[PDB]
Amino acid sequence: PNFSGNWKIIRSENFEELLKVLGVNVMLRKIAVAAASKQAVEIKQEGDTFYIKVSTTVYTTEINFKVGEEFEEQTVDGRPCKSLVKWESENKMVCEQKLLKGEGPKTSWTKELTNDGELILTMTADDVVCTQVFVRE
Ligand SMILES: *C/C=C(C)/C=C/C=C(C)/C=C/C1=C(C)CCCC1(C)C
């Protein structure tokens, strides 16, 4: 099954609460929530190799990984981490993150392709889960 495509966000829930856990002050949280409403995700999937480009109006980032192989990226609030993605089912994967330096909330993310053709991303910090839903452009 295939995540490849150009995805545009239709719903973003609990993102402010996630950023709050991660220590972001209120004005930056509000501006970040607004930036998230413009989020686009481009995915190229080849077997278990993924190329992902996530962008908003003024920023773009590339995430490249192979399932089961450690890689480096950043947490949501922007701290370098070591990440490891595993499948949880046919169309859902889970990424566990570990800070390269220092300490903080336990963070992770998941990506799921639903039977109805939506892409669901969750991002977690401790007890707080943000859910974002995308459809194909
Ligand atoms: C498989 C898809 C993944 C791993 C998507 C990750 C997306 C992010 C880490 C998005 C982060 C953003 C911020 C930290 C604030 C600016 C707006 C976002 C939503 C692009």
UniProtKB/Swiss-Prot annotation:
Result after altering residue 20 to A: Loss of ligand-induced nuclear import
Top-level taxon: Eukaryota
Signal peptide: none
Result of changing residue 30 to A: Loss of ligand-induced nuclear import
Cellular localisation: Cytoplasm; Endoplasmic reticulum; Nucleus
InterPro entries linked to this entry: Calycin, Fatty_acid-bd, ILBP, Lipocln_cytosolic_FA-bd_dom
Alphabetical GO biological process terms: embryonic forelimb morphogenesis; epidermis development; fatty acid transport; positive regulation of collateral sprouting; regulation of DNA-templated transcription; retinoic acid metabolic process; signal transduction
UniProt motif (Nuclear localization signal) ranges: 20-30
The record's note on its domains: Forms a beta-barrel structure that accommodates hydrophobic ligands in its interior.
Molecular function as annotated in GO: cyclin binding; fatty acid binding; retinal binding; retinoic acid binding; retinoid binding; retinol binding
Main location: cytoplasm
Physiological role: Transports retinoic acid to the nucleus. Regulates the access of retinoic acid to the nuclear retinoic acid receptors.
PANTHER family with a match to the protein in the record: FATTY ACID BINDING PROTEIN
Post-translational modification: Sumoylated in response to retinoic acid binding, sumoylation is critical for dissociation from ER and subsequent nuclear translocation.
Keyword Endoplasmic reticulum appears in the UniProt entry: yes
UniProt: all-trans-retinoate binding residues: 132-134
Stated name of the protein: Cellular retinoic acid-binding protein 2
Numbered residues of crosslink Glycyl lysine isopeptide (Lys-Gly) (interchain with G-Cter in SUMO): 101
Gene Ontology CC terms, in alphabetical order: cytoplasm; cytosol; endoplasmic reticulum; extracellular exosome; nucleoplasm; nucleus
